[model samples]
Target: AFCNLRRCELSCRSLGLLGKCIGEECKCVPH
Candidate 1:
């Protein structure tokens, strides 16, 4: 999916953490 915040394309599966794409990068922030 594309990240609207960062205006970049990101693959959810590529991320190591279970989180959404934010801005120019992917973030796995904890709650």
Candidate 2:
């Protein structure tokens, strides 16, 4: 899904998926 990178980073961190965000488009991927 597309999200703001900053927002996505926060969400990813909360979901224990930190550092999984790629590109400025903020696409979350498994790491």
Candidate 3:
């Protein structure tokens, strides 16, 4: 669970610098 969160966060951060995150991509891991 923690790892999934980190992965999402990392992905979001990577895209964040490019102003590419749509906010949905940063949502918690799917149920």
Candidate 4:
């Protein structure tokens, strides 16, 4: 079971960036 606070997504949202997921990972895109 994958468990952990998705830091990428979290930072993205906190920074108002694009918090998304690709495949089985978190993607933080600022655009």
Over the stretch 1-31, how does candidate 1's per-residue lDDT look in tens digits?
A: 4445332223333553345566555555434
Predicted candidate 2 versus true structure: per-residue lDDT over 1-31, tens digit per residue? 6656667777767657753435445654556
What is the C-alpha lDDT profile of model 3 across 1-31, one tens digit per residue? 2334546666656445222234445443322
Candidate with more favorable, higher TM-score: 2 or 4: 4
For residues 1-31, could you state the per-residue lDDT of candidate 4 as single tens digits?
1222366656678778766667666666768
- After superposing candidate 2 on the true structure, give the runs of residues whose Cα lies further than 4 Å from its correct spot: 19-25, 29-31
Give the CA lDDT, 0 to 100, for residue 10 in model 4.
68
Q: Is candidate 2 or candidate 3 better by lDDT?
A: 2
Sorted on lDDT, highest at the top, how do the candidates line up? 4, 2, 1, 3
Task: Give the deviation of candidate 3 from the true structure as CA RMSD.
Answer: 9.3
Best by lDDT: 4
Q: Tell me how many clashing residue pairs each candidate has.
A: 1, 0, 0, 0
TM-scores, each model vs. reference: 0.26, 0.37, 0.30, 0.39
Question: Which sections of candidate 4 miss by over 4 Å?
Answer: 1-9
- Quote model 1's TM-score: 0.26
Candidate 2 has its poorest 10 consecutive residues by lDDT at 19-28
Error of 3 at 21 (Å): 14
